[PDB]
Design a protein around this nucleic acid. Structure first.
Ligand code: CO
Ligand code: CO
Lengths: 205, 205
DNA sequence: GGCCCTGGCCTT
DNA sequence: CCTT
């Protein structure tokens, strides 16, 4: 009977997030770029990516830029044509569409979906703080961790191995990029959730 | 088959923690409960061992009134049966580190509701006791809050249990022991419910 | 960067 | 709302 998205996650509005940084310290390390993918649901009850956003962010003044983090993600904060923006700008934009998406869905509160979510969730909140952003539509401590979910559904914790075992195609060399990860992640979630529905896991009976 | 083969070598340990506040660095640990898991020959997941401890707040610890009023724990009570934070963990690690060798796993992974919280607090406790050879993964956790969101479409522990066809007595909700047991039963439930619908093994289907 | 082991896992 |  219940087609809608709002019903599937108690009224939560699952938004996918990945983040590329200049280190592992959410407080002291710079946010270099962030991508966000909202989800949608059809009348058959199937889950699929909806709208997509991504931003290159300029490190908050005073921020650390760990050399290795740069070696890993191959990002250059100094590059002029980076077309980067202020943490505020990205986050401000990401939020407004999420809120807009929540109303449409009939949800009551957004919740971040991410691989090893806390990490990303950690950085976001910290970025909203520096940005003095308010009304944040995300849940303050509740997250959907694709690492844990993949452990249950596929028996794999790594994003790479999870995507590969699930039957997805995963280009590891392109992974470092934000938009690619948020995409491979969003689909994973949808594949995990949807396969669950196929095996008669949902609805609950 | 075997526990080791179910989660790419991880040894899942269920945990609930009772604290003096929300700051893992400053506030105190008051209660810790832990439950290792095993798998029968058919491949069913059930509770193996159970540990619980009353914790003496560490010297310099911060004790939030707001919190204590919520869980109703009296830290100064000498008839508490409290032990040193070091003593509680050294006994858990001792149990966990051995279950891993028994099941041919490589290392442990914390199963908890909103797992980050407990994980944050436990690691901070391990640091205080300057404990070494910590069997647990530095940052990887199975969040039963999210897993329940997939399996049961619920995020709150009590509803996750109730909706999972379980009993949940909100009267005993502030007890690490009761809480953990209710969590392991819910986790073994979700994991097992997956096997029932043929979600696992992956190939067999 | 922050813990495993005698660099290597991972969300960078 | 619901990890203290
Ligand atoms: Co910023
Ligand atoms: Co302690």
């Amino acid at each position: 009977q219940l087609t809608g998205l709002c019903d599937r996650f108690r009224g939560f509005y699952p938004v996918v997030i990945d983040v590329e940084t200049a280190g592992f310290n959410a407080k002291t390390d710079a946010l270099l770029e962030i991508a966000a993918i909202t989800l949608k649901m059809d009348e058959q009850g199937w889950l699929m990516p909806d709208t997509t956003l991504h931003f290159h962010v300029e490190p908050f003044v005073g921020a650390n830029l760990q050399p290795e983090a740069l070696a890993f993600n191959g990002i250059d904060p100094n590059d002029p044509d980076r077309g980067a923006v202020s943490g505020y700008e990205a986050l401000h934009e990401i939020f407004k569409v999420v809120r807009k998406g929540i109303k449409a869905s009939g949800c009551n509160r957004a919740i971040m979906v991410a691989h090893n979510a806390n990490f990303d969730h950690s950085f976001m909140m910290a970025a909203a703080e520096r940005a003095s952003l308010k009304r944040n539509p995300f849940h303050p401590f509740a997250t959907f961790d694709t690492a844990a979910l993949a452990g249950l559904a596929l028996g794999q914790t790594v994003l790479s191995k999870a995507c590969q075992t699930a039957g997805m195609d995963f280009d590891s060399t392109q992974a470092h990029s934000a938009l690619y990860d948020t995409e491979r992640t969003a689909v994973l979630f949808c594949e995990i959730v949807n396969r669950w529905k196929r095996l008669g896991g949902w609805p609950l009976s």
